[PDB]
């Protein structure tokens, strides 16, 4: 199977999506129309697409919520992450905010308890150059 991140609303350039999926017998022209048809409701957002291809030259795709990395950036108020995480601090997040993002990405998190969901978020935060404030 193949997983990737395409921009909602635009799918057609040969260089990126062309070979990656084409090497698996994926009909690029049918994929682009399909993806651009459903994800038109959220045009402008970057999201992961799971495309299941089989022996038959047909496929199916599933849409997923935006990655935590993107949420943390928009939460802290930054467009670009830090080149050097524990070297250059760019943004900061508060405890209650960590819970907020954790609760939103909980249904897709591999954690069982909320405490575990909070910590996984904190992990990405410190590795992205975001200071955690209580």
């Amino acid at each position: 199977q193949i997983k990737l991140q395409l921009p909602a609303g635009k799918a057609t350039p040969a260089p990126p999506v062309g070979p990656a999926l084409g090497q698996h017998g994926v009909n690029i022209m049918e994929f682009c129309k399909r993806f651009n048809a459903e994800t038109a409701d959220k045009a402008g957002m970057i999201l992961p697409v799971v495309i299941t291809v089989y022996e038959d030259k047909s496929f199916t795709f599933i849409i997923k919520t935006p990655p935590a990395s993107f949420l943390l950036k928009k939460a802290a108020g930054i467009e670009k992450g830090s080149s050097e995480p524990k070297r250059k601090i760019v943004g900061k997040v508060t405890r209650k905010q960590i819970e907020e993002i954790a609760k939103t990405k909980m249904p897709d998190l591999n954690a069982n308890s909320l405490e575990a969901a909070m910590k996984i978020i904190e992990g990405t935060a410190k590795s992205m150059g975001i200071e955690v404030v209580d």
Partner: peptide
Amino acid sequence: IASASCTTXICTCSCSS
């Protein structure tokens, strides 16, 4: 070496649809 749509330079890439 001789494909259709598929790389950034050598010489083909894509072109149908």
